[PDB]
Amino acid sequence: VDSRVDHLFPPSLYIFVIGVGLPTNCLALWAAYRQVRQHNELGVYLMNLSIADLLYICTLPLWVDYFLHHDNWIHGPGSCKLFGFIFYSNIYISIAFLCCISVDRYLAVAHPLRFARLRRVKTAVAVSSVVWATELGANSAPLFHDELFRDRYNHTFCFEKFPMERWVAWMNLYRVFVGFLFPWALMLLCYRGILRAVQSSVSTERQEKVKIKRLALSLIAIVLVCFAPYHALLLSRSAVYLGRPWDCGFEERVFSAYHSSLAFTSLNCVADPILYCLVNEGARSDVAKALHN
């Protein structure tokens, strides 16, 4: 039931994420909008992704103090329900737009000459709206229940309880299995298909093929290295609470790792612009033509 001193790692990783994402996710948003202007349906997804990790980034300050102040912030018994829900519900939105891009890259490279209706800007808007709606609806149970819970150990939390409630375990399991592995499996399969289709192009020079390979592998590996520790610890917590709830002895030995990994989950906000709208020579031109405007 106790805790530790997490005022060093996620007092600083969040600051770095803010300071590197605010001036880069905005430029990724600009590049995505430029893509949308010239009838490129990928940009829509890209654009949404930027939104998905801008309104997330602006949520961090309310939390950095939560981790600078030793594990408590009294800023609103009704405020850790619409700013803090966002904190826990963009990791599962961004990843979805990570998947939507991958399929859109599978359907255009692996299956050209087909599926022209699915690569319109209109259908991109429809899919993006459905993604937003379903992600904001499935993760909507924390809005209902009371969240700001105070212990006697001098710290009160925002959206986490120690030991956690029964309903939290089932949503944690759902998050792990239907917000991380399913979109990640789709990304892996789609980039596998793209590599398998591009290994037959007559018009690629045995070098761009290697560049595509080491870009797709990185795209499917950064998501893993950023989200895996958190969901591994989340599944571990939700499997120990559902075998022995009263004997909350596992929690004390894993609280620090849990919070450090939750902080580490925030590196996708700086990985996404770099890997998606700033690494290639095309969007980088539309960015360098905007830093001078």
Side-chain angles (χ1 to χ4, degrees), residues 233-243 245 249-251:
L233 289 175
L234 210 49
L235 168 60
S236 163
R237 278 184 85 224
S238 313
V240 173
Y241 168 67
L242 305 179
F250 186 83
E251 290 280 301

Side-chain angles (χ1 to χ4, degrees), residues 7 9-36 38 40-64 66-73 75-81 84-116 118-121 123-134 136-145 147 151 155-157 160 162-164 167-198 201-204 207-209 211-243 245 249-251 254-276 278-280 282-285 287-288 290-291:
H7 71 73
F9 198 77
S12 167
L13 180 50
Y14 284 161
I15 281 177
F16 174 86
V17 161
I18 292 168
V20 176
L22 270 188
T24 53
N25 268 301
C26 292
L27 277 296
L29 183 63
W30 174 246
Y33 169 73
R34 296 292 300 274
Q35 293 308 305
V36 176
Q38 51 196 0
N40 192 9
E41 89 278 356
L42 186 87
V44 176
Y45 301 118
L46 290 181
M47 182 179 72
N48 293 113
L49 190 70
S50 293
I51 291 151
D53 60 6
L54 294 174
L55 61 83
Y56 171 92
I57 283 181
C58 295
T59 312
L60 282 71
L62 298 161
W63 288 79
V64 64
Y66 176 39
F67 292 127
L68 279 170
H69 296 285
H70 277 87
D71 326 347
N72 54 357
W73 64 292
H75 310 167
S79 177
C80 46
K81 203 183 280 284
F85 161 53
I86 295 299
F87 177 47
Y88 281 94
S89 179
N90 291 118
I91 301 299
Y92 311 125
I93 278 164
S94 169
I95 188 165
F97 290 114
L98 266 290
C99 165
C100 296
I101 287 154
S102 304
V103 179
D104 210 21
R105 287 172 168 178
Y106 176 85
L107 286 182
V109 183
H111 289 272
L113 279 47
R114 269 89 200 181
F115 303 134
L118 268 50
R119 297 192 273 97
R120 282 164 46 81
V121 190
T123 175
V125 165
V127 159
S128 182
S129 287
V130 167
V131 160
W132 276 101
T134 189
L136 265 75
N139 311 292
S140 63
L143 311 182
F144 294 161
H145 299 36
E147 296 287 4
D151 55 38
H155 57 214
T156 187
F157 313 93
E160 65 183 1
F162 302 92
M164 65 182 179
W167 70 269
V168 176
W170 288 107
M171 185 179 288
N172 282 344
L173 185 63
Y174 163 87
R175 285 167 175 168
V176 163
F177 266 89
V178 183
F180 180 53
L181 281 72
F182 193 66
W184 185 73
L186 285 191
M187 290 201 327
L188 189 138
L189 289 172
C190 281
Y191 283 122
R192 184 176 176 87
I194 289 159
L195 300 196
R196 187 181 301 286
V198 75
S201 294
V202 193
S203 53
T204 300
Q207 291 285 328
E208 302 162 334
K209 276 161 178 175
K211 292 181 191 293
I212 290 158
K213 188 173 182 65
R214 67 184 68 188
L215 169 66
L217 264 49
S218 77
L219 285 178
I220 66 171
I222 301 299
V223 169
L224 190 50
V225 70
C226 280
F227 295 170
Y230 177 60
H231 290 68
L233 289 175
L234 210 49
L235 168 60
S236 163
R237 278 184 85 224
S238 313
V240 173
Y241 168 67
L242 305 179
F250 186 83
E251 290 280 301
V254 70
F255 181 93
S256 284
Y258 179 41
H259 269 172
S260 301
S261 179
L262 175 54
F264 203 68
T265 300
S266 169
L267 276 176
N268 203 11
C269 295
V270 300
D272 271 355
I274 292 188
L275 281 181
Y276 270 91
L278 188 153
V279 68
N280 72 326
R284 191 141 40 75
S285 293
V287 166
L291 270 298

